[PDB]
Amino acid sequence: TGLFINNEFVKGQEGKTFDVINPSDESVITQVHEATEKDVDIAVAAARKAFEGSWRQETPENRGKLLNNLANLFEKNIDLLAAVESLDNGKAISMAKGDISMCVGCLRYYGGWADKITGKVIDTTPDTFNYVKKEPIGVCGQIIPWNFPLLMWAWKIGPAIACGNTVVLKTAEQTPLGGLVAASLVKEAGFPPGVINVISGFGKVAGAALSSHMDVDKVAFTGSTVVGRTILKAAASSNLKKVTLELGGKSPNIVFEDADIDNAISWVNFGIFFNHGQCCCAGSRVYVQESIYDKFVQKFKERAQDPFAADTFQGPQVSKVQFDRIMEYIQAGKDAGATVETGGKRKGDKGYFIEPTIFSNVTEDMKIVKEEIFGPVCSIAKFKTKEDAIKLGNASTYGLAAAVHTKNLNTAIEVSNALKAGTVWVNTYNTLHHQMPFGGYKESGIGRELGEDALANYTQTKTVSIRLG
Amino acid sequence: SGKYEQPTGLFINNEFVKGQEGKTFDVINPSDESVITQVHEATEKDVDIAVAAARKAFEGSWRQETPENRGKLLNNLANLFEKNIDLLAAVESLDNGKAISMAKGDISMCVGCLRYYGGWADKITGKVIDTTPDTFNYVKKEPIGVCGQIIPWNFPLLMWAWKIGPAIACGNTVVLKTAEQTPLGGLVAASLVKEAGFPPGVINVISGFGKVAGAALSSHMDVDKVAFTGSTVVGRTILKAAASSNLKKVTLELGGKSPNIVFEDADIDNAISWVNFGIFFNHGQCCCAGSRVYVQESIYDKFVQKFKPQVSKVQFDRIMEYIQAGKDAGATVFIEPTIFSNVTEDMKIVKEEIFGPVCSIAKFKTKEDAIKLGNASTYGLAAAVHTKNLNTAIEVSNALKAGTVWVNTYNTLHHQMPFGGYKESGIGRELGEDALANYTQTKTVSIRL
Amino acid sequence: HSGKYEQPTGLFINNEFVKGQEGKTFDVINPSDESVITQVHEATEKDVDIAVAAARKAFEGSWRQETPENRGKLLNNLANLFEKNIDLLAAVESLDNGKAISMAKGDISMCVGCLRYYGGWADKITGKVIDTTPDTFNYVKKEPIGVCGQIIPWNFPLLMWAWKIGPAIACGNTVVLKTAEQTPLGGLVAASLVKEAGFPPGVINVISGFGKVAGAALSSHMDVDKVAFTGSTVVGRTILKAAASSNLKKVTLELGGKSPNIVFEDADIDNAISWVNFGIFFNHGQCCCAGSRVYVQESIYDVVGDPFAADTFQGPQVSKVQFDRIMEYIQAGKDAGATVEGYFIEPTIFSNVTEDMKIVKEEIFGPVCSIAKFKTKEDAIKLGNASTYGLAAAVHTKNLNTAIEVSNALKAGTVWVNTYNTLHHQMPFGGYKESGIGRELGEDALANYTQTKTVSIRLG
Amino acid sequence: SGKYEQPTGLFINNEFVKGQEGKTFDVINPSDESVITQVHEATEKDVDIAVAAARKAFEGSWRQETPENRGKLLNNLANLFEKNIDLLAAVESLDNGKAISMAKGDISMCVGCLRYYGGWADKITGKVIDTTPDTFNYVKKEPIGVCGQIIPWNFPLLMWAWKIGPAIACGNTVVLKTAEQTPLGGLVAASLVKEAGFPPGVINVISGFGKVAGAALSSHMDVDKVAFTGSTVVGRTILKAAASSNLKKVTLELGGKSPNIVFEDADIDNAISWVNFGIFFNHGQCCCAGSRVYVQEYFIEPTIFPVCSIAKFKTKEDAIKLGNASTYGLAAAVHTKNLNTAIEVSNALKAGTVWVNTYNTLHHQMPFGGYKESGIGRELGEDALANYTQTKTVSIRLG
């Protein structure tokens, strides 16, 4: 399926195609047209033509109408879309239905916001009139990863289109299929040509080309810190465009004395093993109070024990490079003397399946504890003081999210007030919602994403001061 | 008067001190050209001391304090500023070289600015979201932490007040670096910081150069955010080191070249008075300045006739470079305020950033031509429109590609109204409630049942 | 005009069409041919009690499970239903109220936009968190008020329906709406949509009755938590006094006012006479916001009947009482020496209204306009602002200083500049002084339909 | 101490003046029963004067004034409250009968209160709506105009300071009436009003009785707003008069039966101290005081089952029904350590202020206000400004 430009599926100016492999049986699904720097420039040129006197005319009332249209389409095709994702990405299809649900709530939630962006009328002290507009930024290019390609698709598209920007989305080469079938829905929903363009390519070729584009007004990156620094470096070399990143971090999971146990093991099971641990906020450092530690760890072990089947909860990892980094991390974790409760071996000759991995007898500064593994691999420890879980859990330059299980409100408030995370879950984990914003503290991110906060990043403030008598 | 100062130190932990290297770097008066005196120097080893102070303050001291007495500090400081307005006005006139007449204007604007933000200390509010039943979700604002702030020299004390107000309101400790050309202001201000009873390390004021101290802040691993004012190229400098270091947050306000538009029905007596105040106010040192001025094809000639100290040698030299490029371009034409006319459309003299008293006049016909001409610029920091027609005034201001638009006024700026750029003029707006967004972080707590 | 007919006549209680306990019917007249359409059942004080009980059961039970997402979803369903039956609905509207079916369709469009908007607001109602405490945590919750009684007026029965129902349901309140005696039909047709949309039983109830019997019952009810009145100021005073004698329920009023129209010499050539035409003769002059008195600078001082037809712009008046009230008022206009230019009264224009007599004294609510003449600027502010009513006003000009200064100076809850009688859900509509209590459109409606709640948690 | 008399009059147009009736009324000391002195009394014509003054102030002076200055003025007045905190602290104790320590505590709250709203004067923001068409619409906020403000006796200067804070922040002129029992406070405050530099007639302080002076404010044709604190039945009478007059905005605060709920999982030491404060604080003379308390299975001495009633629930749902089975719900409290208990029960309680592991701590930043018969409008924190502002919507059609 070709590049989505001006509501058409053109093909690559140089005709490059690149290969799409299925993680379940390693076979090759098909090939997808590749954008190079000439493609990116013409895409961006389409976005700007739309921005210029086309979609500036459209009314917020309608911009929401369109978004709601898109969400109903998504909803009309939950089954196709969840399949595409399971094929391309490798996720349990009952899980994939979950993911599209989140897409229909996220788009529709931003549908509501389109007509509710408002500036201010500042009563300046003198006898003058001053209004503060919020306007669209213009061309917004976003790069999304392959954890939640369709979900991340809908995060980026939503905000930008509610506010009235025109966008250019690059799908990660790993999972370029979803964003394209979504793009087909974008034509049924009644969006002008140009408003929304979807690109497939690599970070190093198109990815970059977006970042350095002198006619791109905003980039919005979701992936590894490493590439993020690249992206920041790109914006600075080009036109100083507005950047907002959501890098990943190795978040923690914390259990207390008073806390309920059966929910903990279940939520911390979900906290690391959800999406195979292939999500930004997974809970790889698990900390339990010493009193409860031994039995908890036993009770955690027992809980640990094809995507298209309905029984599966885990699945293939996205690529063998990503598989072979995960496997390099597990051997590193054992090479360091850490015991293994359960974990350490692939499943089956075909496919990238990896087992849920646990580690004990681990020190505070192994390679595995505070460097992003990005698979189903986690660490357990014993803490005793309230101030311990603080010094321990935040002993970390990556603070994207955290958790705290307790029954004592004072502990809950104090710890969560003390924790240095963009998101704190009390008695839950890995539950995101569009209403509440999501982002990285310090090195996990630059800017916040869900909620009304997203909107800030895609609007901007003009001060008009009508001075007179 | 002029006076003789004591340790001209780095303000560190509420104390003036020197550099561990023992280095110093002269300060010179643009009027006389004599050297006023000599101010201490801060290099990487000192910035790491100051960052240590700010993080020390931030941890356990200032987290206990409340926004009402935090507020109760930014007013005291505003009071000190007013008590010694004419003193600070003098220093600032002496060092920068601007007329003591800015005693009220510039140095009071700080009092206003620091007061307003003193206001905002206890008005910071998080959120509560009604996601569902059973669950209970809220959003809270917290202080970012240590902030590096680099100011220029055009409004040394003003800028000083624009960076302390929001940062402190929100509850963050700061480490400030004055310019090399005009460090004197921040240091007296610093004595005022001690007086108003701030606890030690919530404000450290540093002196130095871009190549050394500047760099140390930008790339400092323990700095959580940085905010910067000055040339676009040093901004790009900041953004990179941010990226290499620790992805600390970056707010830039870079200067821009900014237009002034006059229509036939503009009440000419007002229009000429604003454009002149717009371009020459503070020698053209204003980031937002009427670098290029445009007049209707009907009233151009009538309009033109009615119309007719930098900080160091180097700033004095780029204007003489750009003035030379002017006559070279063939364009009809302390420092003489310079004016050019029948300047072409594509020149050096228009498109890059003079930062001195020079102005270039252009002539338009239709309304949409002034749109094409104004927003035809890489720099979009401010713009202004002088007319009387309603439909004209609001249609154009919407169209103009700038972060501040002025209608029947120029260079008149207020602290409750946000000021910023959006065409590589800047990242983020820094005045009014929106500044407080830059120096806070969001944390989301969800409780289940 | 469309043969299909399913005009329900019952009271819409608990997602059902019941009948009056003591069974009273009351006649419905068509203002175009003075004929009786049919008869609708009447609520009385036991009906209203039953009703309030329905709403309160809903609010007490069903709406702990429901998430703001779904409250938003439902309104959108109800919008799409409204938009699927624009044609049927416009027809009832036109038949019942006697207004051109071109206008009635315009009305319903406004309904679907108003419902959608508020559907968008359900998940976006966020309370605050106050972080200025030491070793304490305080959040401020917003929550539904509870049971909200609504009394809509016959000008725009279906529009007013949406204006009331939208905000209240977004926030999580449950409501009981009394239609106007003169136009009960729309609200009941709508009520049928409310069940197809998937609202729970009880959440939304539509009563027919009178301002006296039923109207009083809602406003004096001790289990009704908030009434919302729209209509004559004489009734509003009754509504407040009801609320004070009963249980102090929170009360939002939106009464009428005599709105000014100002025209400045620099202003604009023909669309001005076009806007002021629309300004007083839109909807036959039945809008609270209509521009009764028109003011012009001295320099420049000097459609028929059947609603179901296409060419019509102006239609019947609601009834003979309204017709008769109008005739008395214009009769007084000629009686006072002012020059002059089934149910349908042709639009009159009064000059020589040099003074502020009876014709400019109070609202008329018919197609009667009054012309004034001004010449400075501070006089038009003083002539316009010279009224106990301040709900809307207009200015026409080309002039920026006059525009802003005047509209700053005018004392109306809404001020149009170079336009008139153009409302929009985004922006709040409301009255100054004796015109109103509260604000209605936009985000400010939501305040009227939520309560805050301060939780403070001590630590240590 | 006790001191000179001076006029002791009506504060009108920045000067102490006297009743046109020539009526004076007596002030009694709750402690020794003595008669302190005689303050004059307002009647319908003094009110009409003061309203006239507040209108002429509003109609001219205040335009020239800029929110930056409003705020300066309010904290100036907060500065002066702090100057004579000790004086004003004692006035209040002599007049009302309240421990001098508590009066330091009350004044601090006033200075706080006034300062906060000083903060808010230049932060009043309007809206700008991006209307679908090519129009340009904004939403302005303007002052209502003349306000009537009626205070009880329990926090005569505290309440004084909540009432004038928001009102002046937003740009209104106020006309304040002081309770008959305790007018002494307000009148010094009024001396401090001139000194803080307020233009004349922006704050007028009236003394007099419920019937006469109340009625005059409530029903005054040229008052645009009233605000009321005290019994429910004078409230009803205020609402009613509003209606018969010309439809003032009415914001009222009524005092009620608040509850205190303690599960035995709560810490008993903190619980006991907090309920004791709660009900014996300010001699149970506060709207917030928690008349009834439930646990899990002239001077009047303190009383228990300034009174209180104890009873005992079992499961959690009885705790919520007992607290909310009341005509009244102005405040509440709940003492526990259970997270899920504290969040769930407080949502379920129909109160305008809930306290968890604390009672009667009240902060000017946080809005205080009443449910059901407890009040109409909330009046503290940011939300107060809403009560004293008013929305104007301008649409500008374009080409």
Numbering used by the authors:
A (entry chain D): 18 to 322, 328 to 491
B (entry chain A): 11 to 318, 338 to 362, 375 to 490
C (entry chain B): 10 to 311, 325 to 363, 373 to 491
D (entry chain C): 11 to 307, 374 to 381, 398 to 491
Verbatim from the authors:
Many protein families have numerous members listed in databases as allergens; however, some allergen database entries, herein called “orphan allergens”, are members of large families of which all other members are not allergens. Three orphan allergens [Cladosporium herbarum aldehyde dehydrogenase (ChALDH), Alternaria alternata ALDH (AaALDH), and C. herbarum mannitol dehydrogenase (ChMDH)] were recombinantly produced and purified for structure characterization and for clinical skin prick testing (SPT) in mold allergic participants. Diffraction quality crystals of ChALDH and ChMDH were obtained, and their X-ray crystal structures were determined by molecular replacement. Examination of the X-ray crystal structures of ChALDH and ChMDH and a homology structure model of AaALDH did not identify any discernable epitopes that distinguish these putative orphan allergens from their non-allergenic protein relatives.
ChALDH and AaALDH are both tetrameric proteins with monomers of Mr ~ 54 kDa and are members of the ALDH enzyme family, which catalyze the oxidation of aldehydes to carboxylic acids and are found across multiple prokaryote and eukaryote species. The 3.18 Å resolution structure of ChALDH revealed a tetrameric structure, which corresponded with the size-exclusion chromatography analysis of the purified protein. Each monomer unit of ChALDH retains the canonical ALDH domain organization of catalytic, NAD(P)(H) binding, and oligomerization domains. The secondary structure domains of ChALDH have high similarity to those of other ALDH, including the catalytic residues in the active site and the nucleotide cofactor binding site. Although no ligand was bound in the ChALDH structure, amino acid residues formed interactions where a computationally docked NADP+ molecule is in the active site. The active site of ChALDH would form extensive van der Waals interactions with the adenine ring and nicotinamide ring of the cofactor, which is proximate to the catalytic cysteine (Cys296). The overall fold of the ChALDH monomer shares structural similarities with other ALDH family members from both prokaryotes and eukaryotes, which range in sequence identity from 32 to 57% and with root mean square deviations (r.m.s.d.) of 0.8–1.6 Å for 460–469 Cα-atoms. Not unexpectedly, structural alignment of ChALDH with the ALDHs from maize (51% identity), spinach (43% identity), and tomato (51% identity) shows the conservation of the overall three-dimensional fold of these enzymes. In addition, there is little variation in either the surface electrostatics or surface hydrophobicity between ChALDH, AaALDH, and the representative ALDHs from maize, spinach, and tomato.
